Symmetry: C3
C-alpha cells in the first residue's frame, strides 16, 4: 500500500480508461483485458519463439520465410531476429495496401499553410515511390548503399525514405534543423552516394533555406554523386550545380509508376539515424529491417489500439525516431492513414493541432510534453473552438510527463474521455519499451506503466551492479534480453555500440535512464543517469556543444551542463572562460552554436567565467557546474580536492549575475 | 449489309479447310469459335482468374507471384505477376534440355545451304551457357544492357538468350543499320558490351558488319568489350586489342552449364528501338504473351515446326522466331539468307527440307514471289504446312487468295496477325482452326485485348458495329510494353495521353456487323 | 591366387577390431558390408533417388532444387541440384551455432601450445560475421575471388568461411609458397582482396608472410585491399597506407552477425591452384561430398572430434579439416605447427589433450614419426581414437602395420583414402567399421563413384577381376570439380578427352578377386591424337637416338580436329623429313609429330616444357624464348 522508495506512487488514484473510449472503438479490442496482456507478455519473455513467430507471419508480408525467430545475446552484441527471412519495407508499407484498396488515404499532408495541403492515397504513394526509386536506380543506387534525406516534415520526406528502402538501400534522414556542418558530418560518416532535398522550406509562414545549406555541406562530401531537388517553393533563384543536382519533378517524369521492390534480408540495415550521446561526434544508430518493422507494427497496433478505420496524427518530425516509427512505418505497415504535418503548433495560431484533428477526424494523437506545456501556456483558449470527439487515444513521448500536464492533457484535449499512453522509449529501442496499452492498462499519471512485449525490464543497483529483486525499488533501468526492434550497431563503429549499451552492465542493455518500480509493477522514469541532455524532445550532446563553443578562437575552455526548464524540460547552460560588451559576446557564442550544430542546440544561457573548476589532473569537474546551475551550491561539499578551489566562488557569482 | 465498313459488303466467310485437322497432331486447344468467346470474355472481365492459371501452366517460376494484375493505362503503371521471379533462358532452353536434350531447337539455314546446321536443346543450353559465362566473366550482370548487331542466324539467338540468362537486357540492332543508327541506340541504353561478327552473308554477297561497329563504337564510351563471331573468318578484319574478342576463343574457356539468374516479373527483358524510342518489355508479361499467341493463334503443338521468315532485328523475330517457339519447346527455323537466293524457291526448299508445319511472313515477300517466283512453288512439297501467317502490313485480298492457293493449296489456315512492337505479341488475329477468315481482315482481338473504336473528332468510344475510327484498347495486357527507356513521358504522350483510359495504337480500323476488325492503316 | 594383382596374394583380410564398436558413440551409420553394397548400387544406378534425399538430409537449403543430376563427362557440363540455393558458411556455422552455440568448433593448437585456444560455434559465427562485414564494406560480393595466404590456424578457417558467406570464392594459397607462386595465383584469379598475417610461427621459427605478399602485390593490380592479422605483432612489419588494414582494427567496427548470401548450387565455392591450374569446385555438390564421405567413411557422429593433420593450402585441409567436420557440426582440430615442435610427441599430446576420436594424416608424416619419434607415442593416452585415416600417397603394408600397431594399438580401424584435388572428396576408401581392410588397398569405391579399369592403349573397359589398368570413373559425381578457372579447354583435355566417356584420374590401379582396388603408380604422358594414345617422353627418346640431335622436347597441345597434337622442338626442310621417319620406325606409324620445329636451344630450369606448350599455341636461359617463338612461326 505504502511505498518507502517510489514516493511518486504514494496515494495515486488508479485511472481506468473512460467508458467513452470503448464506445468509439470501431471493433473489439486487440487485447481482451489486462490479464490477457500479462499472459501474452509472459509468453513474449519466456517463449519469444512461439510468441513473435506467429505475429511476424501475421503482420508482415514475407518474400522468403524465416527459419529462426531469435538469435544472439546482448553480451556479444550479435542480436538477430527472423533469420533467413526476406522482405521489403516499402512493399509492406505501400504495395500490399495499394493492391487491396488503392483509393484509401495514406499520407494526409497538412502543409505549413493549409492552402497547400493535400492527400495521397496508397495508390498515389505507390506510383510516386516507384518513380523516385526508378530515379535512384538509374543513378546506380542499389542494395548496400546509403542515401541522405534533408527534407522538412512533408510528403516528399516520406516518399524519399520509402523509395530508398524499396531498392534495399538504407536512408539516413537529417533533421531539417541541422546546420551545414551537421549535414556534412552525417553524410561523410555514411558515405552517402546521393542526397534528396528541396529548394526551400516553409516554417511558420517564413521561407527557410534548405538547398543552400546542402550546397555548403556538399563541398566537403565527395561521396555524394547526385542530388534530387524537390520544388517546394519553385524559387527560380535557387542554384543547381550542373552534373550533380537534378529536379524531382523532371527526373520522376522519366520513369514509370511501378518499380519492383528489392527483397532484402531481415537483418540487412533499413536505415541510419544519427544520434547524440555522451560522446563528441554523432553516432549512426543502425536498425534492421524485419525486427524494426515488426516492433513498429506491434506497438502501433497494441499500445495505441490502431484498427483499419483509425487515423493517426503523430505530431513529430521524421528527423527524429518518433517520426520514423510512428508517423511513417507504424501507421503504413498497418495500412491506416497517417497525418504528416509540415508546420508548427503556433501557426496560423495555437489551435492548428486541433483544427487538423477535427478536419480529418483523427482517432489517435501523439505529441511531446514540450508542446503540451506550450499550448497550456498560450493556447488553452483555442481548444473550445474545435470538436475533438473523434479522438480516443492520446500519446505522450520523448520526455517526462508531469502529473499536472497529464491531467491537463486528459481534461482539455481528451475531455476526460480518452486513454492516455505515456510511451517510454528511445532511438536505440526502435519502438515502445514501457507504455500503457490503450483500453487495457489503467494509468497512474506520470508512470509509463508496464513493459511491452519482448521487453524484460529490470532495475540494477548502481553501487553493486546486481539486479534488484522485488518492488518498491529504484536503480538503473536495464533490459535483460534483446528485442526485435533493438538497434543492431553504430555504423562502422560496433565497438562504440558495445561500450555504450552492452558492456556497462554485462548481460543487460543499458538504457541510460534511471527508474523506479512500485508495488504494482508500474515503472516510473527518473531520467538519464549518463548526463545526456534532452531539450524540447531533441536529444542533445553537451560535449558537441562544448566543441562548438571552442571553435570560436576567443574561447579557451568551455563546459556545458543541463538543468530543468519549465518550457523545454531541460536547458543547456554553457560556462565559458575567455583568453582576454559582455552581452554582445554572449550573443556571439550562442550564434556560434547555431552555425555548427543547429538552432535547436543553442544554449539557453552562456555564463562567462574567469576559470573552470578542475581536478588535480586538470580535468574539468562538471559535477560542480551542475550543482551550481541548480540552486544547490550548498551541496558542493569538500572542494579541497580541486586544483583551483578558488574558482568555485566565481562560478556561483557569475551564474547568479548572468543567468538572465 | 454494311453502310460504314465498305470492305465488308459481300465477303464470304472462309472456314478452315478440313485438311487442317487431318494434320493436327492432337485435339485442338480450342474446340469451336464459340468456346473462344467464353475464354475471351473471361480474359476481359476476369483477368486475374484467366491469366493466373495460364501463367502457372506455360511458364516455370523460381518464385511465385502474389498479384496477377496492377495499374491502369491512365497512370502508365501496368504490372503483371508482381512478386514472381523467373528467367527467360530457363524457360526457352534449360527446361526443355532436361526433358528432351536431343530435340531440335534452332533449325539454322544459312545464306548458302552448304553452311546450314541444327542445334538441339541440349546443344543450345551448352552454347548459351558458354556465351553467358563469357559475359559474366566480363562483369555483365543483372541491370546491364547488351547490344546485339548480328544477322539472322544461330549466333543472334544464342546472344539474346545468353544476355537474358544473366538477367541483363539485350538491345537488338538490325544488322542493316548504319553506324550512326548504331551509335544512337548503343548510347541511349549505355550498353556495357556488344555482340557482333566480322562480316555476314546476305544472298551470296558479304556484308560489312564489324566495319560498321568500329565506325560507331568510336562514339560509344560505355562499351567495354565486344564479342566477335567468325562468320567468314576473314583475317583482314581488325579487332581492337583490349576491347574486341573472338566468340570461339572466349567460349572455349567456360563450361557447358551456367546457372540462370532470377529476375523479377517486371524487370526489363529487352530494349527494342523504333529520334529512336527504346521500347522496354517486361519479362513475365512479355513471355506469357509470346507463348499464348504462339499456342492459340498458330495452334502450335509439341510436334510442330515453326518457320518465321523474319529477322530478329524487329519484334516479329523477337516474339515468333525465338521466344514464342522455344518457350513451347518446339523447334524454330532461323533463316539467314534471302527469299531469292539461290533462287525464289528457298522458302519452299526449307519448308520441304524440315517438314515445317507453320509459316509466317509479311505480305511484302508475297508480292515478291507473286511477281517473280510463282512457279518455283510446285517444285517443292509444301504438304507439311498447317497454318500460314501474315504480319507487318495489311494483306491485300488479292494477295490473301494468292497466298492461300499457291502456298496453301487451299488446304491451310491463314491468320492475318495485327500488332506492333509496343504490343509485344498479337493484338488481333484469327485463331488457327477456330476463327473463320475474311480476306484482308484481322478478325477478333486476342485474349486480354479489349479492342474499341474511338471517334477521333470527339474522342468518345464508338459503340455498335459497322463503324470506323481510331483503334484503341481499354485495358493493358501482359505483353504490353511498359515504358520507353529513360523517357516515360514520351511513352505517356504517345500511347496513354491521347485518349485517357485507352491505349492509342496509332492505327485506324473498322468493325463490321460480325466484329471482324479491318485495319485501315496508320493515322 | 592372383596372376595380375600380385599385391593381393596371401593377404589376410583384417576385420575391424572389437574396440572400434565399443568406442562408437551410437549404432553405426551402416550395418554391414551387405547394406553398403545395396546403398552403393543405388548411388550408381539411381543417383536421383539416392543423392536427392541425402542432399535434403545433410544440407540446409535456401531454395529447393528441381533436378538432382545433369550433364555428362563427355560434354563437361556436370551439375547437381540445379535451381537450388544455399550458403556454405550457414551450413558449416550458423545452423550449429543456433542449435548449440557453446559446442566446440575450432580446436586450435598453435605452433607454441601457450597460444592455443578453442572457438565455439557461437564464437565462430561472430568472427566469421565480422570479417565478412569488413569484406562487404570493402565491396567484396558474389562473383569476386579473394586470396588467402595464412598458416593453418583459426584465421585461415575464418577467412575462408567469411569469403564464402558473401558468395565470393576463396583461393587459399599455401603459406609456404614464394612471392612468385603467390603472384601467378592472384593474377589468374584476379582476386580483389587478400587476407594474410604479418609473420608466421612454425617450429619456433618466425616465417616471413607479409614481406612475401608485398613482394608479390607489386605485380597484382587487381588486389584493392589487404587484411593483416597480427600473428606476431612485430612493429617493424610495414603496412601500405590505403591498401593494408589490420584484422583486429577493422573487425572491431562490425557486428557479430551478418546475413549470409544465398548462392546457386553451381556457383563456385572456391578455387584451389595446383603452370598452376585453378581447380574450381561447385557449392552444393562439393559440400554434399564432404559431408557424405566424412560421415560414412570416417564414421563421424555428433559426439566425435576430428584431427586432420593437414593444411588448408591443400584439398585435404579444405575438405576434411574444414567443410566435412563443420558441416556435420563436430569439433575440428586446427594444428598450426609441426609434428616435431616442441617435440616429436606433439601429435599424440594433442589427441590426448582433446580426446580426439578420428585422426587423419599422410604417410609422409608417419614415416618421419616412425624414424625420429616412435618412442613418444606410448607416452600418451590414445584410447580415445577409433578411426585412423591415411591420405595423399601409397601407404606401405609395413607402414600400415606400424600405423595400426603403434598408433592404433591394434584397436582402431584404418581408412586408406584414395582421392585427388579434382575429386573434391574420397573416391575409394574402406568405410570405418564396415569394410574389412587389406593393408595397402583402398578397397571399394564410394557412393556415386562408378570406378573401372580401362586399357591405356585402347581406352576400353577391362571386365572381370584380377586385372590392372588406368583407373577411370564412368560418370560424374556431386563433388567433382567443374572447371579450371577461365580455362575449360585445359579441363576437358586433362580429365574428359584422354578417355572419352570416362574421367581420367591420372592413376593406375588393379582390382583383385574381391573387388578391392590397389592404387599403382601414375600414368605416363598420354596424348590422344585421333584415338592413338602417344607418349611425349617416348617420342623424345626416339628423336634423340638420331645422332644429329643433341636435345629434344615434345609437348601436346589442343587441336580442333584431332583432339590433341604433338609438337617436337629439336636442338641440333630435308632433315625435317628424316626425323619424322625415325619416330614412325621406332614407335609407330601414327606417332609422328604433327610438326618438327628446329630451334637453337630449349628452355631449362636446373627442360621447362611449360613454356613450349604456351608457345606452340598462340630460369637459366630466358633469352632462348625469343628464338623459339620465331622458330615455331618459321
Ligand atoms: C513543434 C514544432 C514543429 O515544427 P518546427 O520544429 O518548428 O519545424 C517546422 C517545420 O520546419 C522544419 N524545420 C525545423 N527546424 C528547421 C530549421 N532550422 N530550418 C529549416 N526547417 C526547419 C521542420 O522539419 C518542419 O517541417
Ligand atoms: C522517444 C523519443 C526520444 O528518443 P531519444 O531522442 O533517443 O531520447 C530518449 C530519452 O528520452 C527520455 N524519454 C523518452 N520518453 C520518455 C518518457 N515517456 N518519459 C520519460 N522520459 C522519456 C529518456 O531519457 C530516454 O532515454
Ligand atoms: C528480308 C530479306 C532477306 O534479305 P535481307 O534482309 O536483305 O538480308 C538477309 C540477311 O542479311 C541481313 N541483312 C539485311 N540487311 C542487311 C544490310 N543492310 N547489311 C547487312 N546485312 C543485312 C539479314 O539480317 C539476314 O541475315
Ligand atoms: C508487328 C510487326 C511490325 O511492327 P511495327 O514495326 O511496330 O509496325 C506496326 C504497325 O504496322 C501496321 N501493321 C502491322 N501488322 C499489320 C497487319 N497485320 N495488318 C495491318 N497493319 C499492320 C500497323 O500500322 C501497326 O501499328
Ligand atoms: C588427396 C590428397 C592429395 O591430392 P592431390 O594433391 O590432388 O594428389 C592426388 C594424387 O595423390 C595420390 N594419392 C592420393 N591418395 C592416395 C592413396 N590413398 N593411395 C595412393 N595414392 C594416393 C594419387 O596419385 C592421386 O591422384
Ligand atoms: Cl505456420
Ligand atoms: Cl549529487
Ligand atoms: Cl607453382
Amino acid at each position: 500500500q505504502t511505498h518507502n522508495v517510489v514516493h511518486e506512487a504514494n496515494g495515486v488514484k488508479l485511472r481506468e480508461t473512460p467508458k467513452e473510449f470503448f464506445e468509439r472503438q470501431p471493433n473489439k479490442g486487440h487485447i481482451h483485458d489486462v490479464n490477457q496482456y500479462k499472459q501474452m507478455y509472459e509468453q513474449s519473455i519466456k517463449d519469444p519463439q512461439g510468441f513473435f513467430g506467429p505475429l511476424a507471419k501475421e503482420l508482415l508480408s514475407w518474400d522468403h520465410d524465416f527459419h529462426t525467430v531469435k538469435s544472439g545475446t546482448l553480451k556479444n552484441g550479435d542480436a538477430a531476429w527472423f533469420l533467413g527471412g526476406e522482405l521489403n519495407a516499402s512493399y509492406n508499407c505501400v504495395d500490399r495496401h495499394a493492391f487491396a484498396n488503392p483509393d484509401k488515404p495514406a499520407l494526409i499532408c497538412e502543409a505549413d499553410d493549409e492552402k497547400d495541403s493535400h492527400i495521397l492515397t496508397y495508390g498515389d504513394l505507390l506510383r510516386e515511390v516507384s518513380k523516385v526509386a526508378g530515379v535512384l536506380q538509374s543513378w546506380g543506387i542499389k542494395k548496400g548503399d546509403t542515401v541522405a534525406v534533408y527534407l522538412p516534415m512533408n510528403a516528399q520526406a516520406i516518399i524519399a525514405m520509402l523509395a530508398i528502402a524499396r531498392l534495399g538501400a538504407a536512408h539516413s534522414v537529417i533533421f531539417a534543423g541541422f546546420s551545414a556542418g551537421s549535414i556534412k558530418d552525417r553524410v561523410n560518416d555514411a558515405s552517402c552516394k546521393a542526397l534528396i532535398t528541396c529548394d526551400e522550406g516553409k516554417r511558420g509562414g517564413r521561407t527557410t533555406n534548405i538547398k543552400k545549406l546542402c550546397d555548403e555541406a556538399l563541398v566537403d562530401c565527395p561521396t555524394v554523386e547526385k542530388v534530387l531537388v524537390y520544388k517546394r517553393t519553385n524559387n527560380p533563384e535557387i542554384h543547381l550545380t550542373e552534373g550533380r543536382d537534378y529536379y524531382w519533378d523532371v527526373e520522376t517524369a522519366k520513369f514509370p509508376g511501378y518499380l519492383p521492390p528489392v527483397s532484402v534480408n531481415s537483418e540487412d540495415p533499413l536505415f541510419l539515424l544519427y544520434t547524440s550521446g555522451s560522446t563528441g561526434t554523432p553516432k549512426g544508430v543502425v536498425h534492421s529491417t524485419a525486427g524494426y518493422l515488426l516492433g513498429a507494427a506491434l506497438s502501433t497496433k497494441y499500445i495505441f489500439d490502431i484498427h483499419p478505420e483509425d487515423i493517426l496524427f503523430t505530431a513529430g518530425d521524421v528527423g527524429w525516431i518518433t517520426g520514423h516509427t510512428y508517423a511513417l512505418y507504424g501507421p503504413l505497415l498497418l495500412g491506416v492513414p497517417t497525418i504528416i504535418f509540415e508546420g508548427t503548433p503556433a501557426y496560423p495560431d495555437y489551435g492548428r493541432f486541433w483544427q487538423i484533428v477535427e478536419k480529418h477526424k483523427a482517432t489517435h494523437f501523439y505529441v511531446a510534453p514540450t508542446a503540451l506545456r506550450l499550448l497550456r501556456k498560450a493556447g488553452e483558449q483555442e481548444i473550445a473552438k474545435y470538436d475533438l470527439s473523434s479522438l480516443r487515444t492520446l500519446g505522450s513521448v520523448g520526455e517526462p510527463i508531469s502529473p499536472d500536464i497529464w491531467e491537463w492533457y486528459n481534461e482539455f484535449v481528451g475531455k476526460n474521455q480518452c486513454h492516455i499512453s505515456d510511451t517510454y522509449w528511445q532511438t536505440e529501442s526502435g519502438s515502445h519499451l514501457i507504455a500503457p496499452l490503450a483500453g487495457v492498462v489503467p494509468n497512474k499519471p506520470g508512470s509509463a506503466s508496464y513493459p511491452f512485449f519482448g521487453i524484460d525490464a529490470a532495475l540494477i543497483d548502481p553501487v553493486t551492479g546486481v539486479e534488484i529483486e522485488g518492488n518498491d525499488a529504484e536503480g538503473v533501468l536495464a533490459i535483460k534480453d534483446h528485442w526485435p526492434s533493438m538497434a543492431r550497431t553504430v555504423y562502422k563503429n560496433h565497438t562504440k555500440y558495445m561500450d555504450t549499451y552492452m558492456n556497462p552492465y554485462p548481460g543487460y542493455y543499458f538504457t541510460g535512464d534511471g527508474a523506479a518500480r512500485d508495488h504494482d509493477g508500474y515503472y516510473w522514469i527518473r531520467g538519464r543517469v549518463d548526463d545526456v541532455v534532452n531539450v524540447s524532445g531533441h536529444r542533445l550532446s553537451t560535449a558537441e556543444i562544448e566543441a562548438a563553443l571552442i571553435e570560436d578562437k576567443k574561447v579557451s575552455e568551455a563546459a556545458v551542463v543541463g538543468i530543468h526548464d519549465d518550457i523545454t524540460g531541460q536547458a543547456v547552460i554553457a560556462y565559458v572562460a575567455l583568453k582576454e560588451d559582455s552581452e554582445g559576446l554572449r550573443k556571439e557564442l550562442v550564434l556560434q552554436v547555431r552555425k555548427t550544430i543547429g538552432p535547436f542546440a543553442a544554449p539557453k544561457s552562456v555564463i562567462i567565467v574567469q576559470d573552470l573548476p578542475k581536478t588535480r589532473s586538470g580535468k574539468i569537474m562538471r559535477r560542480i557546474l551542475r550543482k551550481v546551475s541548480s540552486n544547490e551550491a550548498d551541496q558542493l561539499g569538500d572542494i579541497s580536492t580541486l586544483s583551483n578551489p578558488q574558482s568555485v566562488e566565481g562560478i556561483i557569482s557569475a551564474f547568479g549575475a548572468q543567468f538572465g
